Amino acid sequence: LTQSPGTLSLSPGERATLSCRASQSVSSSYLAWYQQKPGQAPRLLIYGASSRATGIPDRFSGSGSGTDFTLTISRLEPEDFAVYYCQQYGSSPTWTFGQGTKVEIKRTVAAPSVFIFPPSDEQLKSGTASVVCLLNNFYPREAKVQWKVDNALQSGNSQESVTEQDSKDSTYSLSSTLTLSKADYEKHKVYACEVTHQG
Amino acid sequence: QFGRDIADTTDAVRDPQTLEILDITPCSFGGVSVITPGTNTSNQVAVL
Ligand SMILES: *[C@@H]1O[C@H](CO)[C@@H](O)[C@H](O)[C@H]1NC(C)=O
Numbered sequence: 081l082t083q084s085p086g087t088l089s090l091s092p093g094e095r096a097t098l099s100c101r102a103s104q105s106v107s108s109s110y111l112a113w114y115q116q117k118p119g120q121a122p123r124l125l126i127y128g129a130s131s132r133a134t135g136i137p138d139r140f141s142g143s144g145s146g147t148d149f150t151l152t153i154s155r156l157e158p159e160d161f162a163v164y165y166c167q168q169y170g171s172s173p174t175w176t177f178g179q180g181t182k183v184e185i186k187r188t189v190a191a192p193s194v195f196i197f198p199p200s201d202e203q204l205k206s207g208t209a210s211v212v213c214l215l216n217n218f219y220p221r222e223a224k225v226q227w228k229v230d231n232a233l234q235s236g237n238s239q240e241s242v243t244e245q246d247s248k249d250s251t252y253s254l255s256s257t258l259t260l261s262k263a264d265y266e267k268h269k270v271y272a273c274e275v276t277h278q279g
Numbered sequence: 280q281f282g283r284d285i286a287d288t289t290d291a292v293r294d295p296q297t298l299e300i301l302d303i304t305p306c307s308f309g310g311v312s313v314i315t316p317g318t319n320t321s322n323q324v325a326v327l
């Protein structure tokens with residue numbers, strides 16, 4: 081299955097449309113749609129390519145034809161901020177799900193506040209280093225991060241940068257960790273991190 | 280006792296008990312056109 085756009089990030093209160101599309105491998109009535117918040121079991125929103133399940137708000141609406149189909153959300157709420165899946169019957173043998181379009185609906189717009197952390201006495205006496213660079217209070221998650229000593233260390237195979245965390249501050253946050261030997265903290269005379277955001 | 284139109288039909292009538300005069304207007308009617316993009320474009324339609 082194709083599902084688009086890969087994320088849908090419009091303001092609350094609007095009308096917003098997800099699409100679900102296929103080859104001729106599938107049959108026209110058996111489309112359905114599902115909501116999943118982080119870590120939850122999915123919840124059935126739409127079946128029959130157009131019918132709401134019982135206990136789903138009248139502001140959701142499915143429609144389509146042939147192999148081009150859609151779910152329009154209307155009067156959007158923060159409760160809609162979730163991954164949304166279509167699915168369709170593979171004509172008779174098999175069950176097929178869509179991409180999981182993240183409904184990343186508009187919260188704020190902001191560039192990151194940033195904090196930068198060299199190695200520390202317990203970490204170094206344990207025979208290790210890990211340099212840390214922290215980003216927070218931003219939206220969208222438009223972030224890019226680069227490590228330097230003070231030229232470059234972003235080429236290091238031991239560098240990491242975890243997926244972004246959304247917050248009650250209506251904004252994303254993320255961390256990069258540059259794990260290293262204690263001999264790198266002996267080698268490099270300074271450590272630094274640089275950030276690109278909003279484009 | 281009766282009113283008349285061009286077709287030789289009742290444009291109005293007098294009631295045989297209360298003797299008041301009633302117009303007759305025919306009950307509303309018209310065509311039902313279906314407005315459609317082609318079936319090759321969509322199965323959705325509007326109705327006039
Ligand atoms: C018919 O009956 C009503 C009620 O008794 C009376 O008002 C009316 O004048 C009568 N009409 C005729 C044509 O006799």
Ligand SMILES: *[C@@H]1O[C@H](CO)[C@@H](O)[C@H](O)[C@H]1NC(C)=O
Binds near residue numbers: 317319320
């Ligand atoms: C038929 O519809 C498809 C899209 O559904 C379009 O690509 C194609 O050009 C149409 N052909 C004609 C002749 O209408």
